[model samples]
Target: STGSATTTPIDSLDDAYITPVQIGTPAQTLNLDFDTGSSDLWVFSSETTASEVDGQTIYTPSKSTTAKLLSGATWSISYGDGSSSSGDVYTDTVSVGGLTVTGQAVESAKKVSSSFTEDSTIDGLLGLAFSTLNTVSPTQQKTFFDNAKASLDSPVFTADLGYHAPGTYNFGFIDTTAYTGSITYTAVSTKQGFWEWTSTGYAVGSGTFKSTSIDGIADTGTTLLYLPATVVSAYWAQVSGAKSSSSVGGYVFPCSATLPSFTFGVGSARIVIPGDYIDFGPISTGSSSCFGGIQSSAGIGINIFGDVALKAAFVVFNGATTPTLGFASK
Candidate 1:
């Protein structure tokens, strides 16, 4: 079986794209947000606090014959968005697509923040970055991709994200039929525990490439494409009525205004994100105002090429030494 986990975006996941992953014997399937930005695979479990349970589907390890508890180990993680969870650990058979990883350390949530409990669909996070980024204490944990890499034909995965549509997250093998044109490859720097890279520069509309270098991550978990403050300023300046709305928390502009496509340099190629995707739809219908998905990554430290950017291209997360990133226009 090919070591791959395909993802299908459902509803209007204008926030984050989630993929289904089956765990344990008999396969306890749960829809999880596969995050390339961090490492740790946690789920709502029977151990979760009663009040915080809300409407999430629990992963009862006791029911799974393959489930084994890893006592004394605990985990807690907080996201840039303030969502977080705390849990114990367990080992079980976890499968995605057809690839299976036995004794995969699974974090079972015992506590969760309001953000996690409120967002009913997100059962938990599935981190895809290096296992070193995992939050488990006393003893570290390995991610699914990290554990399965040794048995795979190729240690790699691809994110085929789309705007309001189902896309695939292929592992082990690259299905050339999914993307168009030659794949532009760029060297990645994971020293900071991210699939980070430097874009040659960016351009607003049909303007010339600026030749500036900006460092960021190709994170499928984040919903918006965040660039530096200076970069965001340059882009918004072109939008007639665009302004940093304190009320909306990012750049906002009139919904009817024309939006120009934004392009970023990757090796020898440039990936352009359609302006309509940048608009992010109306903040409130008939309000004549909408939010801009391309916001500032100021407080967060590093810039992020979130779903807003990934959806515009076919991305490859190669697990090669000094892991490289591949991109092509969809």
Candidate 2:
């Protein structure tokens, strides 16, 4: 009723986190992005064109004796980054870590965006968000987490993302040793089909914590942190030579500039993100300017507490009917 999985970063910047999953009867293992922002357990499959396969693995339902086509069912999804995919559906046995779910809807991609094709590290995505966000037509399907939650020990999952290191996604129970300090719980709104919550406010480095309500989603699928322009600007102002550059598409600064740490409040608990995490790295290969991990959310519509922030703490997505989010210092 419980399981754990190791998540590996696809690149040095922690662009994405992928976990190995077994699908179908013979158990074909493929690395998939554990995206908490979306809700569709989709994969690259035999249905996808050869040109879209690139160097990624594909799921062939024909080879799995347990794979059954979800006749007349189809799905389509688009990510905030403008990447998209769509295909038909199949019901099969899907397993993550050691947790198994029978008749899990597995969407097989017939087409994928160029970005997905070029990134060969991930075979597809296993969405961990609410089932309401599932994109299947006529009859929607439950996500892997949703289907397995009923039998899990605690009906919860935790994400512990690390910097340049492997982290873990634990289901059914909270691993006490994975974090430090007491866990802070906050109300979550699933109306948006996201782990949406509001933080008390934030502080720049050693500055005082500002008291304001900041709403955002804990999105592991997103790579950077995005907040209101006012907060983002304040953080960048602390870095000399930092400026919002249209040419670069975000705030960038001299690579050598000293960056300050960022802290956000979850109820009374404060989670601190290291200065090194905010550097985000050079804007281009051997470039003198570097992009910031925190950017203005004005353009993104919804604020995002992405991997940049999630890496600094341990996050719990409690799957109770009345959901709540838990955060703890690590």
Candidate 3:
């Protein structure tokens, strides 16, 4: 009825988090990135071209007796970065942590972008967003969460992202000890097929809170927090020698710069991101300039509260008749 999984940051950059998933008859374990922004449960597989395969672990469906091809079924998904993957579909026994789902749709990648092959830590992606976002052809397949919903004691899941540390993803129940104080709830719009919500306001460091609504999506798959250009400029302006560099591809400042913390409001709750977390990483190896964790979402069309922001608080995705998001301090 419930499941809990430990999620580990792939690298020092915290570019993504990986969690082990068991699939097939004999249980082949693969480390997958649980993407709340996506809807298809896809993986690198035996079907993937040999040249396209790097260090990623592939799912060998031929070896699993329970694996059955979903005739005429195929899927393809693209990301904002232009990276993409596509392949045929198979129904297999899939398990995450302690919960098991029978006949879960698993998209096996026949092709993947160079970025996916370059990232060796993650084998594939398990989409947790609404099934409406599924790209499966003929019949859009249900997401893993959707398929498991009926079996769960509660129609909810929580994300406890960490800052360079292992965190957790809990289903069916909330671990009260994982967070402090009470949760602040807000309505979520599934129309966009994401965990979209509006924040009450934001503040830079110890400054006054800006009482303005900002709509955004809580995307675990994304690495950086993206806000409006005005807000992003305000944060960077506080740092000495910070500039928007074309060569650097984003806002960067001196590694020694004293970065200010960021805070976003959820209802009346304040989720604060430490200044240290804002100094994402060096622009280059041994470089004196460091890239910012928060960037302008102007190009992205919609603001995104990625891992950089999610790691600062505990989040709950409640899939009740009326879905809602809850944020709490950790």
Q: For candidate 1, lDDT tens digit of each residue in 67-144?
A: 999988899998888888898999999988888999998999999999888878888888998888899988999999
Quote the positional error of residue 294 for candidate 3 in Å.
0.4
- Candidate achieving higher lDDT, 1 or 2: 2
Candidate 1, residue 300: lDDT: 89
Model 3 per-residue lDDT tens digits across residues 1-330: 999999999999898999999999899999999999999999999999989998998999999999999999999999977999999999999999889999999999999999999998889999989999999999999988898888999999999999989999998899999999999999999989999999998999899999899999999999999999999999999998999998888899999888899999999889999998787778889999999999999978999999999999999999988999999999
User: lDDT per model, in order?
Assistant: 0.88, 0.94, 0.93
Candidate 3, residue 151: Cα displacement in angstroms equals: 0.9
Q: Compute each candidate's TM-score over C-alphas.
A: 0.96, 0.99, 0.99
lDDT of 2 by residue, 1-330 (tens): 998999999999898899999999899898999988999999999999888989998899999999999999999999998999999999999989899999999999999999999999999999999999999998999999999998899999999998989999989999999999889999999989999999999999999999899999999999999999999999999999999999999999999998999999999889999988887789999999999999999977999999999999999999998999999999
lDDT for predicted candidate 2 compared with the true structure: 0.94
Ten residues in sequence with the least summed lDDT for candidate 2: 275-284
Question: What residue runs in model 2 are displaced by over 4 Å at the alpha carbon?
Answer: none
lDDT of 2 at 152: 97
What is the model-wide C-alpha lDDT for candidate 3?
0.93
